[PDB]
From a paper:
Like the WT hRab23 protein, the Y79del mutant of hRab237-172 copurified with GDP, as evidenced by clear observation of the electron density of GDP. This observation suggests that the Y79 deletion does not abolish GDP binding. The switch I loop of the hRab237-172 Y79del-GDP structure adopted an opened conformation, similar to that in the WT hRab237-172-GDP structure. The switch II region of the GDP-bound hRab237-172 Y79del, however, exhibited a different conformation relative to that of the WT hRab237-172-GDP structure. The switch II region of the hRab237-172 Y79del mutant was more ordered than that of the WT Rab237-172 structure. The partially disordered region (residues 67–70) observed in the WT hRab237-172-GDP structure formed a 310 helix in the hRab237-172 Y79del mutant structure. However, in the hRab237-172 Y79del-GDP structure, the residues corresponding to the α2 helix in WT hRab237-172 formed a random coil instead of an α-helix, suggesting that the loss of Tyr79 potentially disrupts the secondary structure of the said region. On closer inspection of the mutation site, the loss of Tyr79 resulted in Tyr78 being repositioned to take the place of Tyr79 in the hydrophobic pocket while neighboring Ala77 moved to the original (WT) position of Tyr78. Notably, the occupation of Ala77 in the original position of Tyr78, which is a residue in the hydrophobic triad, potentially altered the interaction surface with binding partners. However, the hRab237-172 Y79del mutant in the presence of Intu–Fuz did not show a significant decrease in luminescence signals (78.2 ± 2.4% relative to buffer control) compared to hRab237-172 Y79del alone (83.5 ± 11.5% relative to buffer control). This observation suggests that the GEF-stimulated nucleotide exchange activity of the hRab237-172 Y79del mutant is impaired.
Residue numbers in the entry: 7 to 78, 80 to 172
Write the structure that this text describes.
């Protein structure tokens, strides 16, 4: 049995709260802004013959970039999220990465481009997202929380890397 605290980080409106609700509750609602009224949601899964309890902590956006918060404290893995339709959220990734490393150190991390169902309206070229992932040395996923596309894979990857580097 292992419990893993995972923090989901990135600019406002990229889909962090939706991603957590999708993974832990299996829902996607039509609201302009999602809310999680508790510190974290959780999902208990089996990974490589071990029982893992994933505790997914939501965060605030760039308006709280300098904030030192409970969601980051003792985080054991991290999802860095930007949005297909928000170039500023992509440009912010390196700053979010540096913030997490300075607060918790080196923890398993993945880079996620969410809202890939909106590719027609993309503001990020595929080559530049892949180039950033290679520069930060991070596994990169293109996700659609709305379509339940690659969400499960993100958390499974992080749990496996926590268990075996
Ligand atoms: N089309 C699309 N909309 C999404 C996706 N994920 C989230 N959204 C929407 O993006 C908006 C912001 O999502 P939210 O989870 O509140 O973002 P947060 O501010 O990062 O927590 C909401 O209207 C969500 O329904 C996605 O994969 N595709
Ligand atoms: Mg939110």
């Amino acid at each position: 049995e292992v419990a893993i605290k995972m923090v989901v980080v990135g600019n406002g409106a990229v889909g962090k709260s939706s991603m957590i609700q999708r993974y832990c509750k299996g829902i996607f609602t039509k609201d302009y802004k999602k809310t999680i009224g508790v510190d974290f949601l959780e999902r208990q899964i089996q990974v490589n013959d071990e029982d893992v309890r994933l505790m997914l902590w939501d965060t605030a956006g760039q308006e709280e970039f300098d904030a030192i918060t409970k969601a980051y404290r003792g985080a054991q893995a991290c999802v860095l999220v930007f949005s297909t339709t928000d170039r500023e959220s992509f440009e912010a990734v390196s700053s979010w990465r540096e913030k997490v490393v300075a607060e918790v150190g080196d923890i398993p991390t993945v880079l996620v481009q969410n809202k890939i169902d909106l590719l027609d309206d993309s503001c990020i070229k595929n080559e530049e997202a892949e180039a950033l992932a290679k520069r930060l040395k991070l596994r990169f996923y293109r996700t659609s929380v709305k379509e339940d596309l690659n969400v499960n894979e993100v958390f499974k990857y992080l749990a496996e890397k926590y268990l075996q580097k």
